[PDB]
Copies of this chain bind each other. A is one copy, B any other.
């Protein structure tokens, strides 16, 4: 808006920014030239203004579609897309209105104090090598073997609720003593 408010004071080479001053001081053959300078400057200003309103409205429209996607992906759903919503692992988002759009409030899960533990790719019954398990949404860790969820270290027993049966692999461990219940068959 400041472009329109501030440009009318310019003369663009004219004797005055005022048409009335031009008319009052000059006769038509020169008066015309002076008015015409003001016209060219003002037409230029309006073309620049319009060009920017079109650029800004195109940008805002694209942005609005981004807002649309975030409401559907972020707010109405838990997202599994890293970095789409907020940083860290997305849990929940909220939306409030903002002066020219939406303000997203993304609540994420931020891990800390990481430790290193030793993990298996899977576990097989050493006596029954075709009977193997892999962890579900977590890891098999040494501590013998126990399960922990992937986002938080908290060892718990390996059970049928945190494992899946898998085909045997060369990287799976052969366990022969404290076999977890899914392998005690």
Contacts and interface: CB of A to CB of B under 8 A. Distances in A.
Nearest to A61: B59
A89 B161 contact: no
A16 to B, nearest CB: 16
Interface string A24-43: 00000000100010000000
Interface residues of A, number: 29
Interface stretch (A76-84, A93-101, A105-113, A119-127): A76-84
A58 to B, nearest CB: 6
Contacts of A36: 13
Interface in A127-185: 151, 160-161, 165-167
A106 to B, nearest CB: 14
Contacts of A89: 151
A72 B47 contact: no
A8 interface: no
A69 interface: yes
A83 B68 contact: yes
Given A62-B62, A89-B151, 11 more contacts: A51-B51, A54-B55, A55-B58, A58-B59, A68-B83, A69-B84, A72-B82, A72-B84, A73-B82, A161-B165, A161-B166
26 contacts: A13-B32, A13-B36, A47-B48, A51-B51, A54-B55, A55-B55, A55-B58, A58-B59, A62-B62, A68-B83, A69-B83, A69-B84, A71-B83, A72-B81, A72-B82, A72-B83, A72-B84, A73-B81, A73-B82, A76-B82, A77-B82, A89-B151, A160-B165, A161-B165, A161-B166, A161-B167
* CB-based closest 4 A-B pairs: A72-B83, A72-B82, A13-B36, A161-B167
